[PDB]
Amino acid sequence: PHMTVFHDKENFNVKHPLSCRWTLWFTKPASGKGDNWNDLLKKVITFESVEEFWGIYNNIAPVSELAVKSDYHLFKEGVRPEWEDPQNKHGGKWAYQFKDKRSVNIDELWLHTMLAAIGETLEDEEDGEVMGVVVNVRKGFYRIGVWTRTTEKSKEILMNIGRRLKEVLKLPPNEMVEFSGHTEAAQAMVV
Amino acid sequence: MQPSAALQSLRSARFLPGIVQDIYPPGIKSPNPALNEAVQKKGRIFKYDVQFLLQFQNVFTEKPSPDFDQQVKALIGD
Numbered sequence A: 001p002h003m004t005v006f007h008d009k010e011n012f013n014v015k016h017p018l019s020c021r022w023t024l025w026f027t028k029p030a031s032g033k034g035d036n037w038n039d040l041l042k043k044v045i046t047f048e049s050v051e052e053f054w055g056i057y058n059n060i061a062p063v064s065e066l067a068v069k070s071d072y073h074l075f076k077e078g079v080r081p082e083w084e085d086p087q088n089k090h091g092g093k094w095a096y097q098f099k100d101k102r103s104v105n106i107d108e109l110w111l112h113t114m115l116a117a118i119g120e121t122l123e124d125e126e127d128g129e130v131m132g133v134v135v136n137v138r139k140g141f142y143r144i145g146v147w148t149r150t151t152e153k154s155k156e157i158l159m160n161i162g163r164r165l166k167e168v169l170k171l172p173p174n175e176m177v178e179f180s181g182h183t184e185a186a187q188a189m190v191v
Numbered sequence B: 001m002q003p004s005a006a007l008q009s010l011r012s013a014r015f016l017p018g019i020v021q022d023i024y025p026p027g028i029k030s031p032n033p034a035l036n037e038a039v040q041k042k043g044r045i046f047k048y049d050v051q052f053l054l055q056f057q058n059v060f061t062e063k064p065s066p067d068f069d070q071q072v073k074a075l076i077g078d
């Protein structure tokens, strides 16, 4: 009955749902003209299947091809990847900064981060904390983060998310993943 | 602009009802059943291990829309 994409990648009739819809966003670098530094965040696409995810991923630039000051964000549908969104305003992030060196397969790390997000292995079913994940391309470094809805609903639920991100990123024990609130207030937790 | 066979199939396919163990052909692993064993709402929350998800990487390579390239260029056109 069920032909998956693995039975016939041109004629299949079942697809793999995600536990919510997700939207990919991209931040472009400021234009070299100089007339657009305040409108750089772009909504790319919303999707709801594992197959759709891979159609997107296979047709967009890997992180390692992005210009400096660019970002990708993968957020649950309805949440904009900004601190002002009502679902991020009282939240924060777990983050790690990587050096820009070739033995760091940043594309693979980012990919695995997004797969952990959409495959629901960052948090447990009732945690209600993960809002999205983000990769930032900067001059000195790359940063990978997991944005969270609160900073205090449950500390244990947040620490477990940080430990999972550290596992997903394959970091050794000296390398610490750090939690910070988005606002100075919601900041005033490392693993 | 014309959709691909895979895209046409994706558009018309039906969502699986959750994690299923017994629908994959030889050499393809199912999602880890242990991760879903503890899940309470199995019709809404679907845990897929990264290894399972990676199996799709070289399998579904088609664009998610016919003009995806044009939509992307105009979105980040500058």
Ligand SMILES: C[n+]1cn([C@@H]2O[C@H](COP(=O)(O)OP(=O)(O)OP(=O)(O)O)[C@@H](O)[C@H]2O)c2nc(N)[nH]c(=O)c21
Binding pocket: A081, A082, A083, A084, A136, A138
């Ligand atoms: C996620 N985000 C990023 N920016 C802008 O993007 C820049 C990079 O944001 P960043 O948080 O990655 O900072 P970076 O580590 O590069 O360090 P900093 O710039 O020196 O503090 C910030 O400086 C802001 O100018 C943002 N601006 C707004 N208004 N809301 C956001 O949520 C937001």
